[PDB]
Design a protein around this motif. Structure first.
Motif, PDB file in Angstrom:
ATOM      1  N   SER A 171       0.794  -1.218   0.000  1.00 47.40           N
ATOM      2  CA  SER A 171       0.000   0.000   0.000  1.00 47.40           C
ATOM      3  C   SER A 171       0.834   1.279   0.000  1.00 47.40           C
ATOM      4  CB  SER A 171      -0.962  -0.002   1.195  1.00 47.40           C
ATOM      5  OG  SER A 171      -0.257  -0.166   2.408  1.00 47.40           O
ATOM      6  N   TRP A 194      -7.484 -10.021   0.125  1.00 49.70           N
ATOM      7  CA  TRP A 194      -8.821  -9.455  -0.021  1.00 49.70           C
ATOM      8  C   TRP A 194      -9.256  -8.702   1.225  1.00 49.70           C
ATOM      9  CZ3 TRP A 194     -11.475  -8.381  -4.105  1.00 49.70           C
ATOM     10  CH2 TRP A 194     -12.847  -8.094  -3.999  1.00 49.70           C
ATOM     11  N   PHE A 232      -6.760  -4.086   4.643  1.00 48.81           N
ATOM     12  CA  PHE A 232      -7.093  -2.697   4.340  1.00 48.81           C
ATOM     13  C   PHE A 232      -6.203  -2.104   3.240  1.00 48.81           C
ATOM     14  CE2 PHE A 232      -9.015   1.339   5.591  1.00 48.81           C
ATOM     15  CZ  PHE A 232      -8.092   2.258   5.130  1.00 48.81           C
ATOM     16  N   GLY A 233      -6.849  -1.548   2.216  1.00 46.19           N
ATOM     17  CA  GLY A 233      -6.155  -0.864   1.148  1.00 46.19           C
ATOM     18  C   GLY A 233      -5.477  -1.749   0.125  1.00 46.19           C
ATOM     19  N   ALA A 241      -7.145  -2.102  -3.527  1.00 44.65           N
ATOM     20  CA  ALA A 241      -7.005  -0.819  -4.213  1.00 44.65           C
ATOM     21  C   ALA A 241      -5.577  -0.600  -4.705  1.00 44.65           C
ATOM     22  CB  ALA A 241      -7.426   0.322  -3.282  1.00 44.65           C
ATOM     23  N   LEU A 284      -5.065  -2.816  -7.805  1.00 47.93           N
ATOM     24  CA  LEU A 284      -5.739  -2.163  -8.925  1.00 47.93           C
ATOM     25  C   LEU A 284      -5.002  -0.906  -9.377  1.00 47.93           C
ATOM     26  CD1 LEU A 284      -9.453  -2.611  -7.829  1.00 47.93           C
ATOM     27  CD2 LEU A 284      -8.214  -3.842  -9.622  1.00 47.93           C
ATOM     28  N   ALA A 324     -18.130 -10.433  -8.096  1.00 49.61           N
ATOM     29  CA  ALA A 324     -19.178  -9.442  -7.902  1.00 49.61           C
ATOM     30  C   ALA A 324     -18.624  -8.025  -7.972  1.00 49.61           C
ATOM     31  CB  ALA A 324     -19.882  -9.674  -6.562  1.00 49.61           C
ATOM     32  N   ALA A 325     -17.334  -7.847  -7.637  1.00 44.57           N
ATOM     33  CA  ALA A 325     -16.686  -6.548  -7.733  1.00 44.57           C
ATOM     34  C   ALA A 325     -16.271  -6.203  -9.149  1.00 44.57           C
ATOM     35  CB  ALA A 325     -15.454  -6.502  -6.814  1.00 44.57           C
ATOM     36  N   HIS A 326     -16.504  -7.093 -10.116  1.00 44.07           N
ATOM     37  CA  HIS A 326     -16.241  -6.807 -11.520  1.00 44.07           C
ATOM     38  C   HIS A 326     -14.764  -6.585 -11.789  1.00 44.07           C
ATOM     39  CE1 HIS A 326     -20.563  -5.708 -11.237  1.00 44.07           C
ATOM     40  NE2 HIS A 326     -20.605  -6.282 -12.425  1.00 44.07           N
ATOM     41  N   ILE A 327     -13.894  -7.078 -10.919  1.00 44.54           N
ATOM     42  CA  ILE A 327     -12.467  -6.774 -11.048  1.00 44.54           C
ATOM     43  C   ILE A 327     -11.911  -7.169 -12.411  1.00 44.54           C
ATOM     44  CG2 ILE A 327     -10.187  -7.432 -10.192  1.00 44.54           C
ATOM     45  CD1 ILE A 327     -11.320  -7.026  -7.370  1.00 44.54           C
ATOM     46  N   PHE A 358     -11.194  -4.478 -15.193  1.00 48.74           N
ATOM     47  CA  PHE A 358     -10.014  -3.621 -15.238  1.00 48.74           C
ATOM     48  C   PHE A 358      -8.946  -4.134 -16.190  1.00 48.74           C
ATOM     49  CE2 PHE A 358     -11.831  -2.288 -11.159  1.00 48.74           C
ATOM     50  CZ  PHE A 358     -11.793  -0.917 -11.332  1.00 48.74           C
TER      51      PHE A 358
END
Lengths: 267, 265
Positions: free
Chosen positions: A13, A40, A43-44, A47, A50, A94-97, A100
């Motif tokens: 991160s 998963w 925290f962070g 993101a 991604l 479900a997060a559509h990852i 990307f």
């Protein structure tokens, strides 16, 4: 062991430490079976992975370097861990990852950095379909991956051709996928035209692993009545003579699948 | 009427008809109160909306006015889904804000990009109007705070206002306040950006932006440690007469005074 792993995960991160953590964690992803839920639920951390993906988009006037490709493919490999783990696969989907990664699949440049990027991205989709749940096929059908697969099947690297045909095969094998692909002549014929070109290509440069997936796709399409009738007329002639007879000595499964296909077209 | 709505929703799935369906549906969102559950429960629709977003990423800086208007139509529809109580939770599980964050990272000041950023902010602003814990925690773990600060530092007056409003909502939650005060890197970054905005407001007033900034400072002063640091670093214009004539007409006056009160004790 598990301490040095959690330290690398925390270091994802910060840009100051992320590159090294990506390299180290991707090397141990097979020796850490719980790596995916650790990523998963940290925290962070998703993101941050991604962010590695989106930071490549400006390299798409195509200018991706080998170093850039290797770094982002390390992040892709960690995302693939999340894609395949039973505890995280549903939330990942479900997060559509996977969306990307589609800008990467849309690239056509043939340089080694872009070929490795597309192959690795395709591997993430390959991991999803290997879990065999119906949620996955629904996601693929509603995100326009089928044209991406078909174009890679048409003109990609031999390894990317194989994974992309594998993905289409898994879509076809699903009852909803086959009905979707055969719903209109336009959808069916986009698939059948690419398969036929691949057959011609294969008749000049063998590839047994690709041939098996191509035959399987034709065989599955022939389960659909209108696809079956169209293929009775448009089936490439190289699937009906002795073109592939030699190379199919080893592939007894594929030799059998082709025989089943030729029979189905008659019924 | 109702059938034309379902027809447009179905026409989002195909690239041949999606653009016109985006135009017509965005115009209808206010008059169709249950549009959000209709979009959410139609097969493939949310995914088609995300496709429109992801399709523009390689243009993020050659974006045209036409490309911006189109994706902004999709974004308006995604805002309906974020603001509807039936669909907000699934919207978060769908991670839809993450697809908007590349838009908030752009810097170009051309109108296509400004409208892109403002519309994206509206989606997040609509999300945080409800104070739900799961919304704040999602935004925190997906790094909303650096993106807010970036827009507060460099955006238009309207963009700065929504971004500060969003930061204000995160701060109002105890979890967000604690997170912002958890390290001195983060607290100092927040305090530094707010101090710069105070300077800029002293030279170009804007009551709406000033109200959110004061609210942010007031909330920071609830943290016993953001107090000793804020006593030293609080801008001089928040202690003297600088903003009196613009605060002529009360909520922000009381907040200002209570901020002063809180730092003494």
């Amino acid at each position: 062991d598990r301490e040095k792993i959690y330290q690398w995960i925390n270091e994802l991160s910060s840009p100051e430490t992320r590159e090294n953590a990506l390299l180290e964690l991707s090397k141990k992803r097979e020796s850490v079976p719980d790596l995916a839920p650790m990523l998963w639920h940290s925290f962070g951390t998703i993101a941050a992975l991604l962010q590695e993906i989106v930071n490549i988009y400006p390299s798409i006037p195509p200018t991706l370097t080998a170093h850039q490709s290797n770094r982002v493919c390390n992040a892709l490999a960690l995302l693939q861990c999340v894609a395949s783990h039973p505890e995280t696969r549903s939330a990942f989907l479900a997060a559509h990852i996977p969306l990307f990664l589609y800008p990467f699949l849309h690239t056509v440049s043939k340089t080694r950095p872009f070929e490795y990027l597309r192959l690795t991205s395709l591997g993430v989709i390959g991991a999803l379909v290997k879990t065999d749940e119906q949620e996955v096929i629904n996601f693929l059908l509603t995100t326009e991956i089928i044209p991406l697969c078909l174009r890679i099947m048409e003109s990609g690297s031999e390894l990317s051709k194989t994974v992309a045909t594998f993905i289409l095969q898994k879509i076809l094998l699903d009852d909803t996928g086959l009905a979707y692909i055969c719903q209109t002549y336009e959808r069916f014929s986009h698939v059948a035209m690419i398969l036929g070109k691949m057959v011609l290509q294969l008749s000049k440069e063998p590839s047994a692993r690709l041939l098996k997936h191509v035959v399987r796709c034709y065989l599955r399409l022939s389960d659909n009545p209108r696809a079956r009738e169209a293929l009775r007329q448009c089936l490439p002639d190289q699937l009906k003579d002795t073109t592939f007879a030699q190379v199919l000595k080893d592939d007894t499964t594929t030799k059998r699948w082709l025989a089943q296909l030729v029979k189905n077209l008659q019924e």
